Amino acid sequence: QDVKVFSEDGTSKVVEILADMTARDLCQLLVYKNSWTLVEHHPHLGLERCLEDHELVVQVESTMASESKFLFRKNYAKYEFFKNPMNFFPEQMVTWSLLQNFLNSSSSPEIQGFLHVKELGKKSWKKLYVCLRRSGLYCSLQLLADLEDSNIFSLIAGRKQYNAPTDHGLCIKPNKVRNETKELRLLCAEDEQTRTSWMTAFRLLKYGMLLYQNYR
Amino acid sequence: KQDVKVFSEDGTSKVVEILADMTARDLCQLLVYKSWTLVEHHPHLGLERCLEDHELVVQVESTMASESKFLFRKNYAKYEFFKNPMNFFPEQMVTWSQQSLLQNFLNSSSSPEIQGFLHVKELGKKSWKKLYVCLRRSGLYCSTKGTSAAPRHLQLLADLEDSNIFSLIAGRKQYNAPTDHGLCIKPNKVRNETKELRLLCAEDEQTRTSWMTAFRLLKYGMLLYQNYRI
Domain extents in chain A: 1-79, 80-216
| Yes or no, beta carbons of A20 and B223 under 8 Å apart | no
Could you check whether A1-79 and A80-216 share the same CATH topology? no
Which of A56, A100, A103 lies at the smallest CB-CB distance from B106? A56
Contact present, B208 and B56 (Cβ < 8 Å): no
| Yes or no, beta carbons of B103 and A19 under 8 Å apart | yes
Contact A54/B at CB under 8 A: yes
Length of chain A: 216
Contact B31/A at CB under 8 A: no
Per CB-CB distance under 8 Å, the chain B contacts of A58 are: 103
| Yes or no, beta carbons of A56 and B20 under 8 Å apart | no
Per CB-CB distance under 8 Å, the chain B contacts of A100 are: 20-21, 56
Per CB-CB distance under 8 Å, the chain A contacts of B56 are: 100, 103-104
Per CB-CB distance under 8 Å, the chain B contacts of A214 are: 226
| Yes or no, beta carbons of A100 and B20 under 8 Å apart | yes
Which of B59, B109, B226 lies at the smallest CB-CB distance from A213? B226
Q: Say which CATH topology domain B1-79 has.
A: Ubiquitin-like (UB roll) (3.10.20)
- The span from the CA of B11 to the CA of B39, in Å, is 14
Which of B20, B102, B109 lies at the smallest CB-CB distance from A149? B109
Q: Which helix (H) or strand (E) holds B120?
A: strand B112-121
The technique by which this structure was obtained is: X-ray
Contact A99/B at CB under 8 A: yes
DSSP state at residue A56: B
Q: Which CATH number fits domain A80-216: 2.30.29.30, 2.40.10.10, 3.20.20.70, 2.60.120.260?
A: 2.30.29.30
Cα-based distances in Å from A177 to A10, A100, B9: 26, 32, 53
User: In degrees, to the nearest 5, what angle opens at C-alpha A152 toward C-alphas A11 and A160?
Assistant: 65
* Max CA separation in chain B (angstroms): 56
User: Resolution of this entry in Å?
Assistant: 2.6
Cα-based distances in Å from B160 to A148, B56, B135, B201: 18, 20, 10, 18
* Residue B67: partners with Cβ closer than 8 Å, 6 or more residues away: B42, B43, B44
Per CB-CB distance under 8 Å, the chain A contacts of B106 are: 56, 59
Amino acid identity for residue B219 in this structure: K
DSSP state at residue B152: G
Q: What is the CATH number assigned to the segment(s) B80-230?
A: 2.30.29.30
Backbone angles phi, psi at B135, to 5 degrees: -95, 130
Comparing C-alpha atoms, which of B118, B101, B91, B143 is closest to residue B212? B118
Q: Which of A53, A56, A151 is the best residue to mutate to test the B interface, defined by the most B CB atoms within 10 Å of its own CB?
A: A56
For residue B132, give the 3-state DSSP assignment: strand
